[PDB]
Amino acid sequence: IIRRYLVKQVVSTSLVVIALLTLIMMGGRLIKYFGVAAQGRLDAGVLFSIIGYRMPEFLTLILPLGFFIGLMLVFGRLYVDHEMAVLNGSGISRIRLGQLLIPLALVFLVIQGILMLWMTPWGLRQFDQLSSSQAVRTGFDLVRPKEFISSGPYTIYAGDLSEDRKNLKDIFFYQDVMILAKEATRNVVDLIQGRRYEIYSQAEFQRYRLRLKVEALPSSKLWNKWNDPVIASEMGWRVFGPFTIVIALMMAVALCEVSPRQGRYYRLIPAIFIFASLIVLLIAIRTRISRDELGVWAYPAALAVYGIAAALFSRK
Amino acid sequence: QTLCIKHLAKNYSKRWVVKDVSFEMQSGQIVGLLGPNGAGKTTSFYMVVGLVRMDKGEIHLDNLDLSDLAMHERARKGIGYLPQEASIFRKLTIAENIMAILETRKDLNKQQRQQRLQELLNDFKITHIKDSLGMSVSGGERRRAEIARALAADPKFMLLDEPFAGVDPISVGDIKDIIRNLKDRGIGVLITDHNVRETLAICEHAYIVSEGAVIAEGSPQDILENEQVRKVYLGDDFT
Amino acid sequence: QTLCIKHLAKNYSKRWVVKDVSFEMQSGQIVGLLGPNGAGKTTSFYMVVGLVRMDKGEIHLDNLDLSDLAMHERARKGIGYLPQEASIFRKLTIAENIMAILETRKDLNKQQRQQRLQELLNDFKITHIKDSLGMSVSGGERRRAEIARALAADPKFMLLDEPFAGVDPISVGDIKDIIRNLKDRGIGVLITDHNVRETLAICEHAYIVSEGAVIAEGSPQDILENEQVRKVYLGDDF
Amino acid sequence: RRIVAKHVTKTTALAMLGTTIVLVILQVLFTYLGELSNLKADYSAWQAFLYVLWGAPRYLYEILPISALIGAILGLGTLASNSELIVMRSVGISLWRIVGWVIRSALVLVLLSFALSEWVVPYTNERANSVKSHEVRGYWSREGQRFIYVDYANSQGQLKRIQVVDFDDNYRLKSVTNAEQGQFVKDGQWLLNHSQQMAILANAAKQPFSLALQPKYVHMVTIDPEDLSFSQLVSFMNYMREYSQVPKTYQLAFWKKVASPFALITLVLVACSFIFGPLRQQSMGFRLVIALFIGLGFYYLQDFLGYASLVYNPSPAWFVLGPIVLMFVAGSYLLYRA
């Protein structure tokens, strides 16, 4: 009954924290993308597919962070409302409570293993091909109102811009051909009430038509080729990466002891930085292994250090 | 069985809150750990429970050292703890509250665990409210459920923290009956409490902890007749 | 001065914790607002102070309606509040704690403000700690400095919250003497307290609130010999 | 009243300064970790450390709003959890008076933000750029009915490959003049050599004509409008308006700069109202977590509505001063609920 109580509490609070962290972390990215889309450097209609294809990447970080934050929230709540003094006072240690959640940690480890091995590479492949499709925009696509845009041999001006990136106004185009049009609708663009000049040829018109990664490879191709340092680094990241859930469990068990007066949230900020130290160390380890400087063994090395530290701190 | 506490000590901010507190409590005996507020009775009580780490001394249970044991390691030796604040599992049913501790017992099977749960609910008159959540019960019912839950662990010594706290004179008698039942159940009870007048009404051996040290011991009549206690804690007029 | 309070009522989670609590007070009179825990004594006390917003009821102070005023607006009318918890300004000295409220007074100039911080310190025997920080004094001295600080605002009614809370039987007489001195100073006192044994020993008119309504009133002798109170709160033996 | 005023102001000011120091150190470290991935032969770890160290004033300027919010939260939470704000009310000190005392502390951070933006950030940013990477090329600009293009422009008054195109109200060509080198002597006229003009054909060894380009603002065209100081931004917007149309990305930057002290004050007021209201009796950790959530929400909302102001018709004033006014109203209402 105590295991079910803890599992339900941790699952509920961890899902709440995962939803909050997802909302925050990819709301920041979505706002940044909309900012890029504000100058026309990215289609406004694809910035939702970008977030959809980067769901596994952000979830790869959120799931360990969400599990860790939810674990410390549950254990800190148990400490604050004196449910731990009656669990310890009945013979159930805090380590024993941490061991009762090993099945839940294994379930989260399986979920994040799926994320690391299948969903993250697939989402990154899709996002990379989409971004490569979005990197070819040039000319009238990058125009901004009341400004000069230079893209290769083209110089472009727009006096006004609609809410959507169509129906240009007060258009000035430079090559050498000079084209000035009152209106232009969109590269295939129909210019309305415009004048064309050549640098001396003048041709007025009423209408005119102007016609100016290893992080995403499937694990099937990465299971072998351990010799290549980049391939080895990525494959070790996908293999030893999911085991941050177990470290997030034995670290949340260690750093959750909080007083009723201090609060349920007292120890979250100091310990989120301790977990971020592990994640940053793993990213730095990945970068160095990609340069044939550290070797694949550095992943279990860091994982085993933070643990033997979390285990020693929980057993003092 | 006897719980022997000897030469407790503990310093906070380089100030010796507790200095040489030593008392003995037997099974089936109600012992009250009283004294002036903030004079070291609460810290001594917590060192006995295990909330705060001991600095000097030793706590024994029939030539069995418990000074080095943690809170949970003492709990399997026969020491229980009842926090003053609401310590019921808020989102767990009262029957589930008692059963969560009954399932940790290694000497009971399901057929015996269910019978023990039914008996515990019946003895504390909470069988009618056994299907409600812990956070949706009255204060008296919640405290009865917590005492029933603590008995599910089968403790040999009970360390009650502030039992007559926020209790009307109508319910102080019910708490007296509960503590007397714990005594009659073969469980020694250690009581620390600010409500000295009602604490002295059930305990047959009270220890007065003043200035971090025990200054008195014996029956409540002896404590009341004591000049040292009446000079520092109880005052000239007290009954 | 009379603090008439009529038909207080407050609801929490669609449950009316207080239902028609009404009591009156006079200046220089100790009134104890007692009752079972959670029966509406704390909530009614807070609605008198102003911490808890009033759903229903009227508070008068010499035909001056304080029902719609805020906590600070009532305090400017002469209502004082002393929290149960430690409410001293931790980083200010005791003399600075008392002067911090004496500077709020508008009828006192710089010449006489020192006079009061001299008389307020001497009256409560906290002169020896006038240079010590409020966070580094004993519980009794801190409580005396808090009461002296509260009196610096010149209140007409001092609403004491749990005055005999965590107070040893040796020092309960000191709190009783402080409250009696407050009464002799022309200040009415409202006391809500779990410790009814001593609260009924200084109050000259006690109100018992049970189930959110006043179930008895009168002198402590009448309160003790009250069948409803005897059955609900005090118990047969007391 | 002075002693209570000094107590509240000093407590909240110390909390704001401590949060400022902590957040500045944390952002310096975080950016250094991010900057550690770009090291190369000519960009060593020491160079990337100096780059993030010179950017510290900019990080401070960006932190001051959220630093003030969290500082007010912590300073007033220390007072409230110690039951000091309850006894300030018990003697006759209003909620708005305490809010004004906290705003007194927030005014120090507002003045610090002003000083940084005016005199520190525009210099340390230039220092950071010079440290990292070590005049505008292909400068295209319009002056009313004339379009001028210069390949190389210098802050001392030097031009290379000048090209000016004139037009009519009906947009008809008059002369497309080209030059090789140019010099600045007075406003509205530039001396140049190899002066070749069309006529709707002419040439001249040396002759000056009217053009409104000024060397003072030539080094600002490369700088993003957000990075420009207030004086630089106002001068550049005035220069552009007197001769062309100011881009909306400059109006947005002007409105985010003129509304930063008001955003800071409103954020502090919201923090005070939360302390007196919803965040009363909560733990300090929960108060800090909620302060971080409010800071992130405000930063995201202001960034999004700045981005939304560049794509929608209404002026950026609505999108910038909108959230500030709404949050001020919400905080004032929460203060009315006491």
Numbering used by the authors:
A (entry chain F): 2 to 176, 185 to 195, 204 to 216, 223 to 235, 247 to 350
B (entry chain A): 10 to 248
C (entry chain B): 10 to 247
D (entry chain G): 4 to 137, 145 to 210, 218 to 355
What did the authors write?
To assess whether the conformation of LPS in the drug-bound structure reflects an on-pathway intermediate, we solved structures of A. baylyi LptB2FG bound to either E. coli or Acinetobacter LPS but now in the absence of 1. In both cases, the overall conformation and contacts of LPS to the transporter are nearly identical to those determined in the presence of compound 1. These findings are consistent with a mechanism in which compound 1 binds a pre-existing, LPS-loaded state of the transporter complex, identifying this state as a druggable conformation for antibiotic development. Although the specific sequence of events is uncertain, we propose that C-helix movement away from LptFG during the transport cycle permits LPS to bind in the intermediate transport state observed in the structure of the LptB2FG–LPS complex and that this is the state required for inhibitor recognition.
